[model samples]
Target chain A: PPGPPGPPGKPGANGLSGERGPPGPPGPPG
Target chain B: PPGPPGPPGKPGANGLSGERGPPGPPGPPG
Candidate 1:
């Protein structure tokens, strides 16, 4: 009666890295 | 008699961080 709780733990590893924008300022020395 | 299957309901909220991997191949044409 308690064996259907193992499919919700595999979708939490792609939510802590959604806003990554800090590497675009190095192309003005040419 | 079906109250033991409530664990796979917290997933499906982490799918919006996949669009930043196509700008790393322009450093060898200088």
Candidate 2:
């Protein structure tokens, strides 16, 4: 989560959230 | 659940001393 908007303050990163497929298995299935 | 740092910018705080504990959690979850 780190990459976007690179010009205005130059500390641009820790920006990526459209890339996650595993907050999984915390399912209500027991 | 966080704490650390106090030497890059004073009042340089909203949570930036790693200062999430700067005078931190002086205000947080219960």
Candidate 3:
């Protein structure tokens, strides 16, 4: 009952080289 | 050695406002 973490794309092209990979290592507060 | 730095002039169509001033700190070194 916890599957909804999408829809926030379309905002790149400012230096290229950034296909995801930098937001998943700080979640432990529940 | 002073005529190969002119190929990055095609990225001014997203927000415009960048025609010069951002690369000059020690020229004439050939």
Candidate 4:
């Protein structure tokens, strides 16, 4: 099972136009 | 303009599950 997520979202260098995401996972986040 | 991205990623306090995409607009902005 999964619990809560803290310090969510890890946008990359530009921190913008970042389709990828998170310490959890990224790419096509839906 | 597109505006300064008030902030990135519209993820909610309690995130959504996409184990695969809902394949829709999904849920709310926040």
**Which candidate tops TM-score?**
1
Which 10 consecutive residues of model 3 chain B have the lowest summed lDDT? B1-10
lDDT tens digits by residue: candidate 2, A1-30: 433433333243443334323332322322
How is the predicted docking of candidate 4 categorized under the CAPRI scheme? incorrect
Worst 10 residues of 2 chain B by lDDT: B16-25
Q: Chain A TM-score for each candidate, in the given order?
A: 0.18, 0.13, 0.19, 0.16
Order of the predicted models by lDDT, top scorer first: 1, 3, 4, 2
lDDT, candidate 2, equals: 0.31
Residue-level lDDT of model 4, residues B1-30, one tens digit each, is: 232323354443443332432244444444
Clashing pairs in 1: none
Candidate 3: regions farther than 4 A off: A12-30, B1-30
Cα error, residue B30 of model 4, in Å, equals: 66
lDDT, candidate 3, equals: 0.40
Model 2, chain A: how large is the TM-score? Answer: 0.13
Residue-level lDDT of model 1, residues A1-30, one tens digit each, is 544543343444445646654454334332
Write the residue-wise lDDT of candidate 3 on A1-30 in tens digits: 444444454543555333433333444454
Writing each residue's lDDT as its tens digit, candidate 4 over A1-30 gives 444444434443432232333333333443
Better of 1 and 2 by DockQ: 1
Note the Cα lDDT for every prediction shown. Answer: 0.46, 0.31, 0.40, 0.37
Task: Show model 2 residue runs off by greater than 4 Å.
Answer: A1-25, B1-9, B16-30
Clashing pairs in 2: A1-A14, A1-A15, A1-A16, A2-A14, A2-A15
The TM-score values for the models, in the order shown, are 0.27, 0.14, 0.18, 0.15
